[PDB]
Amino acid sequence: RVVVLTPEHYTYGSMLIAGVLRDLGYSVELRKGGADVVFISLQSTIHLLRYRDIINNIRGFRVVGGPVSMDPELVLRHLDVDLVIQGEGEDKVGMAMEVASLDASEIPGAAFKSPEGFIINEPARCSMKRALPLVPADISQEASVYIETHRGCPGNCTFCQVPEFFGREVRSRPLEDIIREVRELRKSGARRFAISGGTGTLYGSSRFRGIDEDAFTELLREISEITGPRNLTVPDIRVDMVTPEILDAISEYTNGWVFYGIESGSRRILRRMKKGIKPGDVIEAVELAREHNLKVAGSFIVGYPGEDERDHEETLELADELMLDDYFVSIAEPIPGTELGDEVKGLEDEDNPVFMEPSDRKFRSLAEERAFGFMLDSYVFRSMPIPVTDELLRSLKKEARDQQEHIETVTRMLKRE
Ligand code: B12
Ligand code: SF4
Ligand SMILES: [Ca+2]
Ligand SMILES: [Ca+2]
């Protein structure tokens, strides 16, 4: 009857949509990678291009949702789909089914085309009470799953669409809902779990005073009592939203890793990214994490528009001084609908490091050169230095090249080239 399709991976959003359709009373299948109505969950912009042919060849009533829906014009440009639902879609799939079985222009967040242009409705927020996800029988073959704990983020990172997709107010799920969902996923075969939904430490937070360390500690404790502490992680932590109690809870109830989003060591680029942090904040957060005996990983973004060699040098200096336990390096991705996407869509190739000339012609661009250089230097920066070999060098080269290709493709898609 109804089939929910998601490429490459079993995403939490696809499982949630399938579970909502199941609770509504429909016969639902959740497959990775046909029916009368097909709900298509797309998580990356490049999915609009990589799977254009097979999606346009799917029979039946096709409905597309997910993060890519934040730019419905791009989706409808690449995909001849009956309906696109923007934003949260828990309370929208029933009306979409009634449309497939009701006028599509009456669904909040709906977006479709017609011989006289586009009909694009305003999206709306959903209640945090919703159906259990449909867990496929082979979820153990998939960390295994990202559990959403809260929705929305007060941040303003130009490279993130969460504040625009889910809102700027933190809406925390009921703790018992999270516990029951984790219990069900564990019964179904899932063994490794990651928190998700906005920055990690803002669960149970308030609009008036923000961080609630006791709520975060309680969340971590109650989840670890179901999963085991070694099987739980928290992936996105802001350096300005940590306390000693938060770090103690991470140490006692998770695998002991704190994943900071540092992005850059240049104060100028940090201001341009609207991260709301400065290098001193990162240094203090790493020091406080070390004092509580945590493992520390840091996420960095290279190739941001306007980043000259001075900014990259400052980022490398900071990364060396931090001596983190692990480093992750990514090339800036201009997500459509974000401030970074708006800035890159009008940026000429001579000003975009993804299309700027590198000093070494072995690299396809300056951004790939900086990415590979950072990735290589990280193995001599980290607290446990790894002797660089030819195999690791080739692996880093391949990773930088793959990131360069992905970013080039999504940038050319953003500019409608
Ligand atoms: C965990 C995670 C991952 C997982 C994948 C799981 C997943 N994609 O869900 C991993 C770690 C593998 C990953 C990798 C990447 N990720 Co990621 N990831 C996330 C993260 C943090 C949480 C996703 C989640 O579970 N959300 C909670 C659920 C409930 O929300 P949801 O999935 O959006 O679903 C809701 C709505 O979209 C809607 N909905 C969803 N599907 C459908 C379908 C239909 C038919 C309908 C009607 C409605 C509907 O209803 C749901 C409930 O409201 C999000 C950020 C975020 N907080 O959303 C980024 C995010 C999805 N990732 C992003 C990025 C940049 C990437 C990478 C490309 C990074 C890279 N360069 O390597 C890769 C590749 C992704 C890919 N699949 O190709 C972007 C996507 C931007 C875009 N438009 O392309 C996001 C939004 C973050 C960001 N702004 O930077 N990611
Ligand atoms: S803090 Fe994390 S979730 Fe919030 S806007 Fe920045 S990157 Fe997105
Ligand atoms: Ca307990
Ligand atoms: Ca200090």
Author numbering: 3 to 35, 40 to 107, 110 to 150, 155 to 429
The authors write:
To obtain larger amounts of the enzyme, MmMgmA was expressed in Escherichia coli, followed by in vitro reconstitution using a commercially available cobamide containing dimethylbenzimidazole as the lower ligand. Efficient reconstitution was validated by quantification of iron (3.3 +/− 0.4 per protein) and cobalamin (0.89 per protein). Subsequent anoxic crystallization allowed determination of a 2.08 Å structure that is similar to other B12-dependent rSAM methyltransferases, with a large active site cleft. The closest residue that could serve this function is Gln49, which is 8.3 Å away and facing the wrong direction. Interestingly, the MgmA homologs characterized here vary in their methylation activity both in vivo and in vitro, which is only partially due to differences in the native McrA substrates. This suggests that the enzyme has a limited amount of time to methylate G420 before it becomes inaccessible due to protein folding, an idea that is consistent with the large active site cleft of MmMgmA that presumably binds a linear, unfolded peptide substrate.
Methyl-coenzyme M reductase (MCR), the key catalyst in the anoxic production and consumption of methane, contains an unusual 2-methylglutamine residue within its active site. Structural characterization of MCR from Methanothermobacter marburgensis showed the enzyme to be an intertwined hexamer with two copies each of three subunits (α2/β2/γ2), and five post-translationally modified amino acids near the active site on the α subunit: 1-N-methylhistidine, 5-methylarginine, S-methylcysteine, 2-methylglutamine, and thioglycine. In vitro data show that a B12-dependent radical SAM (rSAM) enzyme, designated MgmA, is responsible for this post-translational modification (PTM).
